[PDB]
Amino acid sequence: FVNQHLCGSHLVEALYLVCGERGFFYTPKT
Amino acid sequence: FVNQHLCGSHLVEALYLVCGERGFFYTPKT
Amino acid sequence: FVNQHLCGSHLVEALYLVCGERGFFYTPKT
Amino acid sequence: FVNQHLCGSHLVEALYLVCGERGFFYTPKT
Amino acid sequence: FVNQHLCGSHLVEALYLVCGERGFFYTPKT
Amino acid sequence: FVNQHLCGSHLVEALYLVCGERGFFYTPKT
Amino acid sequence: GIVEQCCTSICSLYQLENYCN
Amino acid sequence: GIVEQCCTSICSLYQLENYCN
Amino acid sequence: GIVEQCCTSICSLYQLENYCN
Amino acid sequence: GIVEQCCTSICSLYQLENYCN
Amino acid sequence: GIVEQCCTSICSLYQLENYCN
Amino acid sequence: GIVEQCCTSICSLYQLENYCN
Numbered sequence: 001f002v003n004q005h006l007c008g009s010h011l012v013e014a015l016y017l018v019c020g021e022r023g024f025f026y027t028p029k030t
Numbered sequence: 031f032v033n034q035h036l037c038g039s040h041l042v043e044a045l046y047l048v049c050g051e052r053g054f055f056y057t058p059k060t
Numbered sequence: 061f062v063n064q065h066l067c068g069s070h071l072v073e074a075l076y077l078v079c080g081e082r083g084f085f086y087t088p089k090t
Numbered sequence: 091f092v093n094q095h096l097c098g099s100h101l102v103e104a105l106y107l108v109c110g111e112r113g114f115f116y117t118p119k120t
Numbered sequence: 121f122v123n124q125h126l127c128g129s130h131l132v133e134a135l136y137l138v139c140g141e142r143g144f145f146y147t148p149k150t
Numbered sequence: 151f152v153n154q155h156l157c158g159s160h161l162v163e164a165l166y167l168v169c170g171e172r173g174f175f176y177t178p179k180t
Numbered sequence: 181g182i183v184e185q186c187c188t189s190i191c192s193l194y195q196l197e198n199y200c201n
Numbered sequence: 202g203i204v205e206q207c208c209t210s211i212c213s214l215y216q217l218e219n220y221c222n
Numbered sequence: 223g224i225v226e227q228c229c230t231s232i233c234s235l236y237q238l239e240n241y242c243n
Numbered sequence: 244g245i246v247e248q249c250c251t252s253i254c255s256l257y258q259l260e261n262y263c264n
Numbered sequence: 265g266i267v268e269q270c271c272t273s274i275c276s277l278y279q280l281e282n283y284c285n
Numbered sequence: 286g287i288v289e290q291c292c293t294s295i296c297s298l299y300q301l302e303n304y305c306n
């Protein structure tokens with residue numbers, strides 16, 4: 001895999017694909 | 031607003047939109 | 061709901077989720 | 091180009107691509 | 121059609137819609 | 151990581167994520 | 181409308197230009 | 202859970218706020 | 223307009239809702 | 244091909260690396 | 265190349281079409 | 286955090302994986 005530059009909703013997309021049926025938490029600063 | 035079917039990546043995109051900075055959890059096992 | 065920062069095609073996505081089966085118009089400047 | 095099925099958010103993404111600055115209407119009731 | 125400003129994954133989306141079942145190659149610099 | 155169904159634009163988004171700078175081919179006829 | 185032309189059926193990119201402003 | 206409420210069934214945007222932190 | 227506002231500044235879902243048909 | 248491996252069936256993220264250049 | 269052009273400048277769908285298989 | 290790192294800098298899928306449940 002390659003390193004990523006991910007903002008906004010692209011991060012959430014990437015988490016989605018990575019975690020699958022496990023799901024994930026999205027927790028930005030502030 | 032409205033009610034639609036929101037599945038997969040579309041669901042986490044909607045969570046991102048609605049929650050934003052608050053953050054969210056996507057936990058499909060429940 | 062939280063305030064949004066939405067460019068390009070992210071705006072159209074947000075309109076889509078917000079308006080549902082009502083639909084929407086996308087009308088940028090110029 | 092081609093012909094595909096374009097549904098939901100994918101349809102308004104395609105409208106955005108094709109119309110861009112002209113703007114468009116997405117009116118699923120018709 | 122209108123001219124496009126497309127970065128990252130938006131380019132790949134645009135190639136997808138344009139090429140259809142023909143498919144495409146994505147080949148960035150370096 | 152996980153295994154999911156990845157179709158259409160979602161598949162090329164995943165290829166983009168995974169391959170990135172390397173580039174990729176999306177060749178649905180095979 | 182659009183949904184029928186492009187989702188239910190299939191459409192080209194040129195057809196989708198029908199819905200531009 | 203969410204998948205049932207929003208994908209399998211339908212949900213509002215307000216319901217989706219149930220899954221915010 | 224809304225397209226420009228949401229990008230250069232911020233906008234709300236309530237403001238977005240004005241663009242529904 | 245890819246469509247069969249990843250859409251019709253399921254695939255990992257490692258399998259999808261098969262289609263990198 | 266196309267990837268860089270479309271991002272740093274602008275590109276057309278016709279130019280994109282050259283990258284189809 | 287991860288949200289900020291991936292945007293202001295770069296991140297890996299392996300780092301992303303830490304945010305799975």
Ligand SMILES: [Cl-]
Pocket residue numbers: none
């Ligand atoms: Cl879908």
Ligand SMILES: [Cl-]
Pocket residue numbers: none
């Ligand atoms: Cl962006």
Ligand SMILES: [Zn+2]
Pocket residue numbers: 010070130
């Ligand atoms: Zn984007």
Ligand SMILES: [Zn+2]
Pocket residue numbers: 040100160
């Ligand atoms: Zn989709």
